Design a protein around this ligand. Sequence first.
Ligand SMILES: Nc1ncnc2c1ncn2[C@@H]1O[C@H](CSCC[C@H](N)C(=O)O)[C@@H](O)[C@H]1O
Ligand SMILES: Nc1ncnc2c1ncn2[C@@H]1O[C@H](CSCC[C@H](N)C(=O)O)[C@@H](O)[C@H]1O
Ligand SMILES: [Mg+2]
Ligand SMILES: [Mg+2]
Ligand SMILES: [Mg+2]
Lengths: 291, 291, 193, 192
Amino acid sequence: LYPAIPAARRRPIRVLSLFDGIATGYLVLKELGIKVGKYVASEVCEESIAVGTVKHEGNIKYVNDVRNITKKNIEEWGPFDLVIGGSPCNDLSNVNPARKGLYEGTGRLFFEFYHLLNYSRPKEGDDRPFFWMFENVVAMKVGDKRDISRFLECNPVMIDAIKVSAAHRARYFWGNLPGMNRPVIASKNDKLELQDCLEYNRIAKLKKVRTITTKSNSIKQGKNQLFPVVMNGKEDVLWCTELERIFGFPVHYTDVSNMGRGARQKLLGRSWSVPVIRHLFAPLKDYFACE
Amino acid sequence: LYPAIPAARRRPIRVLSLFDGIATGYLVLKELGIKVGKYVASEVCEESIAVGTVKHEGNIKYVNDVRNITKKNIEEWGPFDLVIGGSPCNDLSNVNPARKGLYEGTGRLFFEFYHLLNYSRPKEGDDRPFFWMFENVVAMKVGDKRDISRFLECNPVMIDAIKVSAAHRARYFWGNLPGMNRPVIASKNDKLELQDCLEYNRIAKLKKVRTITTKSNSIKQGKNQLFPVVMNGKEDVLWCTELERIFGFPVHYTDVSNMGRGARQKLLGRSWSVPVIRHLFAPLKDYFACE
Amino acid sequence: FETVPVWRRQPVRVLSLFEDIKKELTSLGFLESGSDPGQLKHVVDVTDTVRKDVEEWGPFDLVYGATPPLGHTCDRPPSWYLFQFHRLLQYARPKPGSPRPFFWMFVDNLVLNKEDLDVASRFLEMEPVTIPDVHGGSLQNAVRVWSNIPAIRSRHWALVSEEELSLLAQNKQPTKLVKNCFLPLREYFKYFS
Amino acid sequence: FETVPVWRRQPVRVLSLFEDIKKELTSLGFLESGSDPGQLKHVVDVTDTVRKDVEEWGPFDLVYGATPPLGHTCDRPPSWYLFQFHRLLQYARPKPGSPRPFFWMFVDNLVLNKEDLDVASRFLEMEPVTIPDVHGGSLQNAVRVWSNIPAIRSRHWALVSEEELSLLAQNKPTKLVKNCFLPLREYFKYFS
DNA sequence: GCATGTGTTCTAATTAGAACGCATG
DNA sequence: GCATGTGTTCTAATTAGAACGCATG
Ligand SMILES: Nc1ncnc2c1ncn2[C@@H]1O[C@H](CSCC[C@H](N)C(=O)O)[C@@H](O)[C@H]1O
Ligand SMILES: Nc1ncnc2c1ncn2[C@@H]1O[C@H](CSCC[C@H](N)C(=O)O)[C@@H](O)[C@H]1O
Ligand SMILES: [Mg+2]
Ligand SMILES: [Mg+2]
Ligand SMILES: [Mg+2]
């Protein structure tokens, strides 16, 4: 589908990340070993940006709200070899009873990704490589999922984070990355059971954890919503460092900006499962420099 | 002065830590390279014990409230090569206008250190090595400092953490450690200015900060209580990661038990300046095994 | 877009969506009344329309979009008509080398709110022009227009006061309206009648 | 400690803290009636005395500690008297080898709160015994005693409880504490 | 010559927590 | 068969902030 590139012809990667959150895309790309030439992030949340700059020491160019990016900015900041983004899903996920759908509220920010993706696309006659990816929730109105795919002219592959993590997270992934439909396999350094994510003297009640949202209620599991962890014979909730390892983020990744328990889960609740993104970005190593 | 010990005759160190806090004693002992045979800590604050157990993976034997440590406990848990501790100073420091001296309130807990120290002392006819150390604040009544010295039969050494950290911390140190009166020196890895303790894209207004207490008002500096940090052209308070670097603790040392900003500052505000304790415990590596 | 000599002005191949303007454009005289495969294509529900659908429908000289007029007929969200218009618009763009003039226009009948209107202009790369279409005795018609037709961006319409004209919008509760805005297309294509 | 032959019982050497019992002790024949100071040494304020002082004050056979008698005349906190008493006690204790019998005792005239009492007993390694002086028509004397004297503890004294001792805290020696000191007679010289 | 401090207290903003929601395999 | 969910919300705890304090180089 994509023409192969010899190693010497490979140049560093130039990524436009919209709705960057806590810079999961940059983290995955650099943990893979890909040389990141430029990482332009569009993010509005201050605490999110604080995580991105501090943890990545200012390699990320922040360009705030996506709706103020013009066609000129895409050509100035460009060219981009990869355009990634997850639009907010508070008005698309079925967890919200008062969802407002794709066309109202917050869902309409999807079209901003679609708009700026066309700006970033190489013009006809530019055979150079170009990849993109878009993520959102599975629990979405079939009309909304239909329309998203309509605008992106692509159908999503669903990858559930439980194959590679200790948590339920089923998300759709639109894109043109090489081999997205390939079978998802676990790695030997993937913490597949909740017990592998816990700290010392902490016992896991379950092997896997229900889908983690922003709020504290998604930590307590099941019918009766029991605590997931026992410590010293006492029921307890997950810890921030444990939520981070569930997601595949480095430990203390969100120990930033004096953030407490709730703020760190709020950022983590919206984020991506790092091993899932690593599975998606892995074939990019054969198109860009690596050191 | 105790006789020098040949390298082969040295055994691991067995230390009894009273009012252990966040296991600063174990930390500097392990970071000095000293083999810790046993570390018996008597601590009552749950979050404190959480930091000690998790950050050191259960090498610390916690033996709750110190007033419940019997004589028989000392010989069973013993023998002890080192006895360390700092009693609560909320009823001794001048920062509290309602202090109750060391004979009422929490000041009586000093005599518990005096009581259990005499238990741990090697009986006459046993001139094996034995070291002890006790820490408290300088801003105490001269009668309190007088009586403390009386019971311990020793006069204190004042060491201010400003020589080795980026913070004012003047505390008395009673003990018999080799060369406590020697001039303290800075190391290469000693972060001596606040800029060295701050994160990326953060600017320090001052070189040194005032004495860190448990409360957030001690982060504000000077007559007008200005913010100590500027970031993005906005004034901000110190971060928990930065307070840890100020005290010499490892980064994310207090990222335990879902603790927020206030809780982590409360544990750190009452702790020891790690480089000061490293200076005090440094000559011990000539009396015990090191690996 | 330089103008075309009269003897090489082909008839328009127009795609009009959400609203049939066959009557308006035949009257002005862009369309044959005799019908071979129709030059105007009209669709109203394009949620299942793909690029090769538009591509197979033959090259299009103009793409027209319109919100429904004021009433209870708005089955869908207001922003849906624009996003779908912008989506199909890219499907109708020819190869980079432009063999002929390509025009596009999107009209709003005072349906979209201001949050929708600034989203509109960002996607259409152009702030809208308003058509007063108001005689001294009758202020009946009023529409908003985004279009790359030069004369719809070139000429001086008569200005209006928007606070008073959003009051016209819910006081409501065609030629000069937008068919006068259709006239400048005449220079680029063929006149029939 | 076993009991001593009558012909080897040397005169007792005592150190009394915060309270002088030279009058109470001479009454029961422990100090020579005239000009024998070496038996009792008395110190009222101790905050500045070092072990080298107690060591130089001659070895002691008994170390007595006492609280101020019930009355609003104490600048020191109630816990101060025990902590200082415990401080000097280990200064006065002889070498691990026992040349003679060494005793100590601490009495409270109902001035310590309960938490002062539990701290007191933990430091003195025993819960105290209470000594009531009751005659039915009198409710006069009552004190608490921590001591290593073997006979002051064992004798099953009259058992009465503390809410009556706090009826004495609503009230907020010759017969009672002389009976307390008698068992020391079997270990040192009787002067009569 | 004033600025400083291993903290107590009471208030005003905070957040934590659980109820709410229901189409769907 | 019925447990599930990249969230909104309202309320009950809960914490963050500033006043407060004064002997002392
Ligand atoms: N108007 C806007 N412009 C840019 N970013 C926005 C935005 N509105 C919301 N966002 C951000 O978009 C993010 C969507 S949640 C997705 C986070 C990201 N995919 C991750 O891996 O963490 C949120 O962090 C939100 O702060
Ligand atoms: N009765 C008691 N028994 C044991 N520990 C106690 C205690 N009362 C208070 N403490 C603990 O003693 C500690 C004194 S603050 C000193 C902490 C320690 N020096 C450090 O480096 O962190 C506090 O953490 C307090 O929780
Ligand atoms: Mg960091
Ligand atoms: Mg950890
Ligand atoms: Mg010195």
